[PDB]
DNA sequence: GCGGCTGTCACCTGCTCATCGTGTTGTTCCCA
DNA sequence: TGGGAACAACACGATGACCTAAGAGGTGACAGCCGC
């Protein structure tokens, strides 16, 4: 509540499955697959 | 104190309504639990479902809650008792719908063979 | 069927949520109702995954839509591989 | 960053039935 | 068809306030969370 009162209009927040729906809509998979391929190509131990 | 909260809520203060209902809801939950736990049937799985109704009742009683020196706790614990009684009314009437899939599927055959 | 009870729970909580939205109820009440609707659909799809199960007439758990597919008595392992059949009989066996 | 351990997800198995909180309205019955 | 009466619907919200008992499975496979 403090954050929303102080510096609102820059970030958007939510609770429950609405937040997940917004992320799954906005989030695109190509770039994520790219970084995952980068890290698996050069990874150590559990992280890979 | 609850008194100022109810005063601002009947006035129409949204923050006061929020803060007062945030206190009403735990009371409604506790009362619905301690009643419905000991009653027969599957009423125990409606405790929360009743609490929300109790809160809804309060949400529609504040606009005309003419105070008479009665604490708001009394108002909530009267509404909760009435809702519990209404659930009992709905339960005891014709308690024939038994949710047993071991008779409809295995024991009851199709009418057309 | 238990599915009727679970569908009734989800429809109850959905309608109560719609009412609460219409009245402009505070954040806490709408949040509680939305959480309850989430748990209701969760019980509809799988009663036992999270929390306590929703019991039916007795203390036994209710049957979820996914509980009707798995297990020994599920659809696959009781009705699609092994079926009761017509033109069949049985009796005790004696030596001729 | 990489271990323990610590839970959590899989499998294996099987006829009885207890009430409220008041008060009112409208239909739908029961008698005559 | 009159009164006399039974269920299904409703609208409110009786100066007082918290569960309940039941409850010994076993064995793998694993991915997290917590500790180094």
UniProtKB/Swiss-Prot annotation, chain C:
Residues 48-68 are annotated as: Disordered. Signal peptide: none annotated. It comes from the Bacteria. DNA-dependent RNA polymerase catalyzes the transcription of DNA into RNA using the four ribonucleoside triphosphates as substrates. The RNAP catalytic core consists of 2 alpha, 1 beta, 1 beta' and 1 omega subunit. When a sigma factor is associated with the core the holoenzyme is formed, which can initiate transcription. Belongs to the RNA polymerase beta' chain family. This is DNA-directed RNA polymerase subunit beta'. It comes from Streptomyces coelicolor (strain ATCC BAA-471 / A3(2) / M145). The chain holds residues 338 to 433 of 1299 of the full protein.
């Amino acid at each position: 509540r403090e954050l929303r009162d102080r510096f609102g209009t820059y970030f958007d927040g939510s609770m429950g499955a609405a937040a997940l729906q917004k992320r799954l809509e906005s989030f695109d998979l190509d770039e994520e697959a790219e970084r995952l391929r980068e890290i698996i190509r050069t990874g150590k131990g559990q992280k890979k | 104190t609850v008194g100022g909260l109810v005063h601002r809520a009947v006035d129409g203060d949204e923050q006061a309504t929020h803060d007062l209902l945030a206190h009403v809801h735990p009371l409604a939950l506790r009362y619905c639990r301690t009643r419905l736990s000991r009653l027969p049937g599957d009423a125990r799985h409606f405790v929360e479902d009743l609490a929300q109704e109790v809160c809804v009742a309060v949400l529609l009683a504040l606009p005309r809650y003419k105070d008479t020196g009665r604490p708001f706790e009394a108002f909530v614990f009267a509404i909760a008792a009435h809702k519990v009684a209404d659930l009992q009314r709905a339960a005891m009437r014709h308690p024939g719908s038994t949710a047993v899939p071991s008779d409809e599927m295995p024991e009851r055959p199709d009418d057309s063979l | 069927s238990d599915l009727n009870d679970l569908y009734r729970r989800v429809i109850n909580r959905n309608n109560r949520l719609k009412r609460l939205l219409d009245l402009g109820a505070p954040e806490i009440i709408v949040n509680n109702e939305k959480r309850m609707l989430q748990e209701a659909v969760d019980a509809l799809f799988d009663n036992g995954r999270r929390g306590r199960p929703v019991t039916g007439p007795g203390n036994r758990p209710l049957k979820s839509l996914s509980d009707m597919l798995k297990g020994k008595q599920g659809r696959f392992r009781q009705n699609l591989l092994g079926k009761r059949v017509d033109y069949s009989a049985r009796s005790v066996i004696v030596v001729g």
